[PDB]
Amino acid sequence: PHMGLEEKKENKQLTYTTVKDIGDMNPHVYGGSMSAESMIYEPLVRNTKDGIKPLLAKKWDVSEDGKTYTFHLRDDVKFHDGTPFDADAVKKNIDAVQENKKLHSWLKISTLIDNVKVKDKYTVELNLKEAYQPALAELAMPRPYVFVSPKDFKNGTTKDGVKKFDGTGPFKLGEHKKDESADFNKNDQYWGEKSKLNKVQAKVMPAGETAFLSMKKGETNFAFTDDRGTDSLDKDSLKQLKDTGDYQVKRSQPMNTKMLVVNSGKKDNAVSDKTVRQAIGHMVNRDKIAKEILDGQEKPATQLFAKNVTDINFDMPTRKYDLKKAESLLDEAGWKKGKDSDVRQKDGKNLEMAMYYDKGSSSQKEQAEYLQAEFKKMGIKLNINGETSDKIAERRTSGDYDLMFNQTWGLLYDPQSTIAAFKAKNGYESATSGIENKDKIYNSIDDAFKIQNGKERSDAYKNILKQIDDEGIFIPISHGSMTVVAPKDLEKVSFTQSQYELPFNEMQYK
């Protein structure tokens, strides 16, 4: 371990282990690694524990009617190709985003942006259809309203890709070898807090033994939970790495709910039947999962968004583990047992379903194997399939799945953006599409977001989530945190409100 660690400390470098590549680094679409994109691209403002703060915009005014935001931009910023950041760059970026506004409909501000006007070189005006108090908060998201050099647009937009990946941030993208590595090099010209690290490299490899050995030999010296929730090192690997004396391990506050998604819209499978979904709701021993399978590292989750989360001020416990209840519900549904078979049948077909998990996640894999044994006791043939997180996301979008592991979006998004995503193609619309009352639930979601009083908004969320919970679309399991393994002599590793970034430009000493 020491040899590789010492070289990297000398070079002021981190090389992090990850199971997936950085993907499409165009931050106006959603495929690219979120933490990589937060290292190189920046929004107008930042959303912190202490609310909205200046970033590329120094200051802003809102009009009396709430419909015009004027942003007074820093005048000392360049993109990484040396081109200038100014009001025209802001306008061309926001306008490029708005050409693809169907992709961004999960974020309400995209449905309100009317136009953008350059008032002068460092002042830009954003006009909305109506007042919208969360505007600043949404403009603070790491996608899509962050700024790419206009020299990198293709055919006058970003909608079909970008030529290179120039932003304003503390790192710039260097060499990328597809499915192997990507370099984030110190931006020596950065307008703000300059990086104390010269290089962060993302090194792509499988999890399990190979990530562990890589970390143990100091070929990699850093790990963190990726944007899909996967930790490359299990609990025994973290223990052994700490036991070397060379690594430290840090863990954030609880940030999310990890859940099973049940596809109501999958017409060709039993999960499209509500009664079967309810049965499945009783087949998930979340207390045992959290205590025995996740080794007590995560608390069990009995609802989608914990009572402590913004605008959720209620306790609404979900279906409990109860295999007898499961069995009578399957019987009610016509899936009958016995007759010399383990598998339940209805009209002479066996009850089969396919569950999908991230093969890079040992904890997802272990839960999936447990649930396969449990489903077997109930007379379900569960076929489990470990896939890339990329391929899991594609199924979430298309609807090609019966059940999948997933997780909510964390402190900046839960509950409001995650609930919006219940009817978004690139969110969980697949899973909610088969609910009988979906028109009204969807309209309730639209309406909840108009309610200004926080207590009433909270009530509107409760009525939505009660009906989502009755449908058995989401089975909460545990609360996830972010975990970071880093060299023991690396100082200043800390967490933001997000599960999708780290302050790489503040970390130092190695």
Ligand X SMILES: C[C@H](N[C@@H](CCN[C@H](Cc1c[nH]cn1)C(=O)O)C(=O)O)C(=O)O
How far is residue 331's CA from residue 354's CA, in Å, rounded to a whole number? 21
Q: What is the SS3 assignment for 423?
A: helix
**159 lies in the binding site for ligand X (CB under 6 A):** no
Whichever of 335 and 357 has its CB closer to ligand X, that residue is: 357
Whichever of 228 and 286 has its CB closer to ligand X, that residue is: 228
Q: What are phi and psi of 357, to 5 degrees?
A: -145, 165
Least distance in angstroms from the C-beta of 149 to ligand X = 21
Whichever of 427 and 480 has its CB closer to ligand X, that residue is: 427
Describe the strand order of the beta sheet including 123-128 as a list of residue ranges: 57-62, 68-73, 123-128, 113-120
Least distance in angstroms from the C-beta of 30 to ligand X = 4
Which residue from 143, 186, 282, 423 is in contact with ligand X, where contact means CB under 6 A? Answer: 143
- Residues between 236 and 255 with contacts to ligand X, criterion CB under 6 A: none
Which residue from 21, 86, 227, 429 is in contact with ligand X, where contact means CB under 6 A? Answer: 227
Least distance in angstroms from the C-beta of 262 to ligand X = 16
Q: Which of 244, 360, 249 is nearest to 4 (CA)?
A: 244
- Residues between 90 and 109 with contacts to ligand X, criterion CB under 6 A: 106
Q: What are phi and psi of 370, to 5 degrees?
A: -55, -45
How far is residue 423's CA from residue 411's CA, in Å, rounded to a whole number? 20
**152 lies in the binding site for ligand X (CB under 6 A):** no
Whichever of 173 and 241 has its CB closer to ligand X, that residue is: 173
Least distance in angstroms from the C-beta of 348 to ligand X = 39
Whichever of 98 and 123 has its CB closer to ligand X, that residue is: 98
Least distance in angstroms from the C-beta of 182 to ligand X = 16
Neighbours of 155 (CB within 10 A): 8
Number of residues that make up the chain:
510
Q: What is the SS3 assignment for 458?
A: helix
Which residue from 159, 228, 274, 423 is in contact with ligand X, where contact means CB under 6 A? Answer: 228
Helical spans, DSSP H, in 421-490? 429-432, 438-448, 454-471
Q: Which of 321, 325, 262, 314 is nearest to 287 (CA)?
A: 321
Instruction: Tokens 């080794």: give the residue.
Output: 295
Which residue from 30, 60, 165, 171 is in contact with ligand X, where contact means CB under 6 A? Answer: 30
How far is residue 95's CA from residue 75's CA, in Å, rounded to a whole number? 21
Q: Which of 448, 225, 260 is nearest to 368 (CA)?
A: 260
- Residues between 401 and 430 with contacts to ligand X, criterion CB under 6 A: 409, 413, 426-427
Least distance in angstroms from the C-beta of 426 to ligand X = 3
- Residues between 455 and 474 with contacts to ligand X, criterion CB under 6 A: none
**Number of chain residues interacting with ligand X (CB under 6 A):** 10
Whichever of 132 and 409 has its CB closer to ligand X, that residue is: 409
CA atoms within 13 A of residue 250's CA, in its CB half-sphere: 13
| Residue ranges in contact with ligand X by CB under 6 A | 30, 34, 106, 143, 227-228, 409, 413, 426-427
